[PDB]
């Protein structure tokens, strides 16, 4: 009898972690940091709803394709949702110049207010009602974009248009207009009389003379003609003047840019639900509590950092071991209120007290090290949506290689940090356990025999209140020295 | 007499590794992971040959510059090889719009099939044979691009061309055409009669009216005129219509895009050899076995990861030490079948048995850690060729800074990983050796005296079959205890 | 009496470092590596002065806006300084095509030489003196750009200009010209007679016919007309020919590109001082001695690496502890000439000698590890200035995300390296101190009793010259063995 052992926690845990050195290492306590689920729904972002475009493209929305919903309420939005291949775009076919740049403006815009700048009924000298088409059906009747006017010769005459608008608002105006490219020389005269026309636009920054480019083209949405749209931002206190002799697709409504901020165009097929989120991906929203996730790289909102991993587990406690007779052989299920501690084995005692002078000192630096790991990726790369046209494949690939490149870099960093500090965490517990034993051996010097399994046997009587002499860094050699003095030479001369 | 020692491997090795802390550290076993050689040849990639362009540029190939080889076999290719400054390009001088975007399409294309869409002899109303030039010699005779037709007025008349082609194939078609920019007003009439002309092209996506831009220009390849080429991809089931009144350089042959995939345009001066490779760089092919290389950043194929380093050596075993009398003084050349082990020194024995309970346990986690290091760069950045024109210097520099930037990042990572796990590898062996000694000291407790050099001397007789009691974690103190009991007090009372 | 202790340095230091595990760790010796100050001045770079543009933009400089200084001395420069919103640019309003590409050329250019190519007085057939404007005041009198000529009809006639210049210099020429866009059809005739005009330019690489685009525009700097400028680089031995029938803004002076190299356009509001620097940022110059800084990301010159951190401190020495009686309890202020060492306590002695066999061996690998850390970021990312126009927002954001992305990556690396090697540095000292004790215990074996506080008490007389037996790895057990032999059994039988 008369012993004492140094030992460590063990429990029912089957959590597993990895290191540089080993895989699947069972530990007492561990912390998952990777989010892997989403809810498959499309939600408001912290109370603010997305602008859902349904089957419409940004072009169809902005020009007012009759199949598309106008937003009369002038709502603000958190993000914009556009399907992958929207069916309602330029119902009258053609091109929309610097479309992808316009879409990129929307990513920093959170609210429009449509304002009328040239009322449809202010074109005295021209036909403002015949410009409609079977390609733009509203309720099965031929119609046209709601926000631009297809002006047409009146009484076989098309008087020169010169018309100006002064931006007397505080806000930038987004202004859109267009030009008609007819099918042949006869069509041009039929519509606009004058055989050779132009559309001239002028601001303090933009000077442009546009000219109708006639070609023989195959039918799109039934039509061989085309229309080409343009856009500009008219700054506060600047003015814009249009002059045309024909083919002018004139603006009616402009868009006051009333709120700039963090926004996005998300490409998703989902539809909106009664749902709110902190973090939205194109395939569903995420419970943003953990610091990493692998759901989708184009997450927006207050999001965890995206990494290309199947798992990310930080070790926090000891390995999980029976585990009998001191630390050399494993950990104690019997120890409950601590990670490292002791075992009494007394004339009075049984054992299993915990040393929380070093248990708390370890729970201190572990939970401090954990938060440090997470916050070290506070500035981790976050991907940003952009689109490119079919003649911008190089910069599109540049952009892909950059974003994938940063995701790979940070994936690597996140993994390496976890593996490396995991090895350091497990190694710390080892050194803490080995430190505990040494604290005791440096106290009980001669008065006890090292048993080689993690326990000491006393060459003297100790009793319970000396069993905290040893725990409290207080045991004094002298006051038990003379008793030990004698009993060990009794061993040296016993049987 | 009566001893036993704890010791470690040593051998003839002069392999050297580095750590954060020290350079040039001699070790027992080490693993080079950096490829530094190439074969200076240009090879097929895994059985598939490159498309070698010789002295021709992609433009010269595609338009059929008479000096360039057509590939009648419609071969597939693994990569394309273009010299740095090819001598055969636009033999008739001019410009090729969105050339760099076209070249970027080739990087995802692996096979063309040339098809005739407008046969050269189908231009009834025009001269399809006089459009040839001293600038385009075929066998010293004046000639012209093989795949486009320089249509010319017939009988002093040039009737309006309107001509259509429907893509009734499964595959995308690459279609090229052009327009002639004459030298002066008289030249225009001499060639095309009609003083004011255009070239109009129309598909469902492309609308274009082109106009001849006359200027007085210095001679290139002898000529002051210029020709400007265009290209489009005509989707399956779409049609393309051309209309011109003059200056039309019409297409004859289009290119069926029959195989898309991983390809590249490599800028190299080398010529092809009977040679196959897994990994090709512009200065030679590489033996893709090691995980890193430093030959060239624009390697393609199944390649090691490129890093800007002169060396990369992983330590696998112990440092390399004579080295006498236990681990405190160095390693044993005498130990051969293990990294750590013992030395007998018995009434019967000599020594040098190896502890492979911990040798194999170390060879386990070292070879497992090695593979983990390599696979951690599986997603390392790989550079991708692209070209830019002289008005795209900003995005060209963006692209350079990005690729060099990622190469630097991964160079850093690769080096830091090797140095850091090298320090961890050497430190592991130390702790393994120190662990071995402790296993023995915790067994032989009182029965032996620690000699302070890594060896124990027995206070009792052991014999050979107890010398595996100690090796096998099986030695029991008690069955030799009473013999030791007596002999140590004989030391305490000897001479 | 009769003792000896193993101990470590301690001193007056209050330097603090951090690790992964702990913050604010007081150490004996530490090395700041982060530069955080600048001098708020704009300096020459290593003897070479910046080209200070004052209130002028690159356009105003190059065209010779009468408000801008010409640099008649043809100076070379280290960088160019442009204010954020320069007030003197196109005094006659309009556009400058591929302006941002031109600015990017300046970033690789270090010296121009202005040369006259078409002398202002060589335009016999035209009015070379009436083209001046109230928008371009020189000394309150109407004037015009100094380097281009606004040619005007002479005697109500404007004869066709055809004019050529051959670049017979070694150097590339930067050549600028322009075209006038009038306000209305009457203005065109008033100025250039001929109602329909063009400006044609031709080199071996550039073919261009420019056409005047009339529009009704609001007044900028008082004027509603606009002028559009163009530029090209004319290679040595190439020639450029201009032809116009009106609206030609002709070149007078071209710029010989005489020195290429490392340069930059810095956006700064500062003005130049009698000051020289190695490293210049837009808000001030930096004392480039330390390896990192956080002053500004757009630093140029021979600069430390920019990181987004408030502090970066490498630990070099031990933690800073009174600290009595051996290493178990803290470090010795009393030890002065070393980091680790001993304490005598002799019949003759007091103590405090330093073990510089391991002190120098640690100062060796610490100062070697430090330099290794710095040089590992030799290839760290460095940001590069570029500008983008209002239709290049996507590539501008691409460029921002790339540069911020690399700065974040390297910020992370720098921090992680310091924290991790800091933990390794502190841990090294611990292991060095623990190694010292063990060197002594493996010598003095039986002859001394381990006191458990870091000190040994001798069972024999040692004297001073044996106190270096112990320090010099030379103490021999035998020559004191028989004396110890007896005195310990006197303890075993004392009182
Ligand atoms: C979009 O079009 C689909 C056809 O695929 C139609 O069934 C559906 O009603 C439309 N969705 C919305 C949200 O309007
Ligand atoms: C390319 O041109 C060179 C002239 O530098 C000529 O000698 C050689 O035959 C050509 N090479 C090939 C592969 O046709
Ligand atoms: C620039 O213009 C300012 C007006 O803000 C004027 O006061 C100053 O003299 C000018 N600075 C220089 C360096 O010419």
Automatic annotation (TrEMBL), chains A, B, C:
GO terms for molecular function: host cell surface receptor binding. Residues 374-408 form a coiled coil. It is found in: Host apical cell membrane; Virion membrane. Keywords: Clathrin- and caveolin-independent endocytosis of virus by host, Clathrin-mediated endocytosis of virus by host, Coiled coil, Disulfide bond, Fusion of virus membrane with host endosomal membrane, Fusion of virus membrane with host membrane, Glycoprotein, Hemagglutinin, Host cell membrane, Host membrane, Host-virus interaction, Lipoprotein, Membrane, Palmitate, Signal, Transmembrane, Transmembrane helix, Viral attachment to host cell, Viral envelope protein, Viral penetration into host cytoplasm, Virion, Virus endocytosis by host, Virus entry into host cell. Disulfide bonds join 5-455, 5-455, 43-275, 56-68, 91-136, 279-303, 462-466. Homotrimer of disulfide-linked HA1-HA2. Binds to sialic acid-containing receptors on the cell surface, bringing about the attachment of the virus particle to the cell. This attachment induces virion internalization of about two third of the virus particles through clathrin-dependent endocytosis and about one third through a clathrin- and caveolin-independent pathway. Plays a major role in the determination of host range restriction and virulence. Class I viral fusion protein. Binds to sialic acid-containing receptors on the cell surface, bringing about the attachment of the virus particle to the cell. This attachment induces virion internalization either through clathrin-dependent endocytosis or through clathrin- and caveolin-independent pathway. Plays a major role in the determination of host range restriction and virulence. Class I viral fusion protein. Responsible for penetration of the virus into the cell cytoplasm by mediating the fusion of the membrane of the endocytosed virus particle with the endosomal membrane. This is Hemagglutinin.
